[PDB]
């Protein structure tokens, strides 16, 4: 179902000029993360830039995590993806939420302030507990 | 447990010459997605090609999503991975299911029609509801 | 909640010189996977190396999977990520757990034996059951 996530706004544009992350529709899996830039950023082929989303989140439950993923169309069509490929957010992380924006493509691409550059999916996770064995059972 | 997913077949080879996506075993996490090509495709180093799977899916439940991921061995050994890195499918998406096939490797690779080029994992997701705070609690 | 995972130690350094994978904190989503190398490995720009974690796991439940993901900071700052982008581990897989370490960066990077090179997230998955339809309902 649903999960309450605390949000701290670090850039005053968020909620104003740049909407807070939101599900585009009722059936969307991911919330859109936007580039909180002071000017357009032209990201060169194979360049990585660390971009602020203008917020911090705190998931607050040990069996919840979030992953930052590329946008499907932008990642395919323009190669704007993530330098760390999938950004995993721990339930106890409280820092600024940053996107490692990597242009894997062969052409430069300009991201304007407020443009959607990734998405955030909140998901349930399990906590593994190991048992060391000599041979696996079952 | 299980989840019913509606499937629309867009290429008549699916279910015939090219098996529908299936779990290889009872313990497989992912269903294999195959390249619905009219001829072999030689994908050059660093090239991305959008490839049809010959179907459309509709997950139909707001707390279910699917991710398209590279094959482990093909992605490691040959660099055949995804141009958008992880393709997230929303519960309300109804369009053709396409794979952004990116050859990150240094050698060209030939994909034959019907070859497995990615896998699809169906998973539960949470719907985040934000609360804006000045300082995080707990 | 939690999930028991059987672990087979293949390199005697594991648990000794190199800690077993563990959650760094109570709120960590991922367990750290370490490089079980016999000497430091200098991974060239765009090179992929298959690196042993010195173990094998067996998740053992059909609705559990695990994904190997890059480290967030190492993947962003140094481009040390995964050749297959996300390594999905099936519930019935029993083989050595290996990391496809890809340096997507422009500079070489040296990984020392025992260094953390990826993380492993254990998560619930659904088993899809298709129904072929001519038109989607609902």
From Swiss-Prot, chains A, B, C:
It comes from the Bacteria. Substrate binds at residues 71-73, 84, 88-90, 98. Keywords: Hydrolase, Magnesium, Metal-binding, Nucleotide metabolism. It catalyses: dUTP + H2O = dUMP + diphosphate + H(+). It is an enzyme of class 3 (hydrolase). PANTHER family: DEOXYURIDINE 5'-TRIPHOSPHATE NUCLEOTIDOHYDROLASE (PTHR11241:SF0). This is Deoxyuridine 5'-triphosphate nucleotidohydrolase. It comes from Coxiella burnetii (strain RSA 493 / Nine Mile phase I).
